[PDB]
Amino acid sequence: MRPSLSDYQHVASGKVRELYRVDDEHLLFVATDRISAFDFVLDTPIPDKGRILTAMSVFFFGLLTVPNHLAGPPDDPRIPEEVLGRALLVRRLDMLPVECVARGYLTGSGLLDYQRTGAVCGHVLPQGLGEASRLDPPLFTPATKADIGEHDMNVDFAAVVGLVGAVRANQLRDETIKIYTRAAAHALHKGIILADTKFEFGVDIEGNLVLADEVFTPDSSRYWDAAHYQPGVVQDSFDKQFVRNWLTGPESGWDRASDTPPPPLPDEVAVATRERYIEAYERISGLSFSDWIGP
């Protein structure tokens, strides 16, 4: 039989993911159905979101040739029934304290840093760029985790060197850009722009660099519809724009500038959002989500 989740020890939680100890060398990486918008975890879950994002991550791990932390199949008997399809058995690594970000387009904190200083994470950029400008080549824009409530802090390459070593910093930069370039080209061929992405890496017993966490989900990466890409304006979030529009619309009764917790979402908005996740997955993977495992 499959074990109960209660048989494993909880070791870490983020906004929408959970981590459990399985044994001395393995963890259970669990995606939930929670969704974040405007830095709030919302009251309303998105049905099947954890399963869809897990399916997405597994697809991209298989597409990339680099070592990763997966330690068994999606139906591995160590995975509890309750989280089947939204949990992965992974190898325990010594995690490197760097959020490895690649940006193919200028938006978010990258754009803000540019508009304030003309540079992003130590990269002095051409004049005349703006919202959703294409960056060629993609930029390595590393960050570090801050306090529980604060956003990650953008740092330059020298900071990464100070965190992990000179040779390892070069390796993180090179692998981050290589992996992003491959995945972004694949997605764009299928009609989706991966505008940026955030990786975490760890090191195994042999000193080898291993890709961990989740990769190229719409939570770790900005997904845009390529058919509507228009430099100079803010691009719609492929997955989250219905949620963002409703929350900031006339029907929510919520003022975002108040920074009070937002209200629950309409059922219709949650279902529409689920559909967007499935569309993105099926377009990128060429697979049917109806074939993905579940309880």
Ligand X SMILES: N#Cc1c(N)ncnc1-c1cnn(Cc2cccnc2)c1
Nearest CB to ligand X, comparing residues 51 and 69: 69
Q: Does 92 bind ligand X (CB under 6 A)?
A: yes
By CB under 6 A, residue 202 contacts ligand X: yes
Judged by beta carbon, residue 217 or residue 285, the one nearer ligand X is 217
Q: Assign 195 to helix, strand or coil.
A: strand
Structure tokens at 194: 């991966």
26 binding ligand X? (CB under 6 A): no
Q: Is 29 in the site for ligand X (CB under 6 A)?
A: yes
Kindly tell me which of 50 and 262 has the beta carbon lying closer to ligand X: 50
For ligand X, give the closer residue by CB, 15 or 228.
Answer: 15
Is 14 a binding residue for ligand X by CB under 6 A? The answer is yes
DSSP state of 258: G
- Where do runs of H (alpha helix) occur along 118-214? 157-164, 166-189
Tokens, residue 205: 């017993």
| CA 295 from centre of chain | 24
Q: What is the maximum alpha-carbon separation in the chain?
A: 61
CB 89 within 8 A of CB 54: no
Stretch of 9-17, 56-64, 154-162, 184-192 contacting ligand X, by CB under 6 A: 9-17
The two structure tokens encoding residue 71: 């330690």
Minimum distance of ligand X from residue 94's CB (angstroms): 7
Confirm or reject binding of residue 184 to ligand X (CB under 6 A). no
State yes or no: residue 27 binds ligand X (CB under 6 A).
yes
Quick one: 90 or 129, whose CB is closer to ligand X? 90
Q: Does 165 bind ligand X (CB under 6 A)?
A: no
Alpha-carbon gap, residue 237 to 277, rounded angstroms: 11
Per the CB < 8 A criterion, the answer to whether 11 and 29 are in contact is no
Cα 234 to Cα 132: distance, rounded to the nearest angstrom: 7
**Pattern of binders to ligand X over 207-246, x per CB under 6 A?**
-----xx---------------------------------
Residue 11: CB minimum distance to ligand X, A: 7
Q: Going residue by residue from 55 to 84, which x/- string records binding to ligand X, judged by CB under 6 A?
A: --------------x---------------
In angstroms, the CA 283 to CA 261 distance is: 34
Cα 181 to Cα 37: distance, rounded to the nearest angstrom = 27
| Smallest gap from residue 267 Cβ to ligand X (A) | 28
Residues 6 or more apart whose CB falls under 8 angstroms from that of 293 comprise 74, 75, 84, 85
Closest contact distance (angstroms) between CB of 23 and ligand X is 13
Question: Which parts of this chain interact with ligand X (CB under 6 A)?
Answer: 12-14, 17-19, 27, 29, 69, 90-93, 95, 202, 212-213
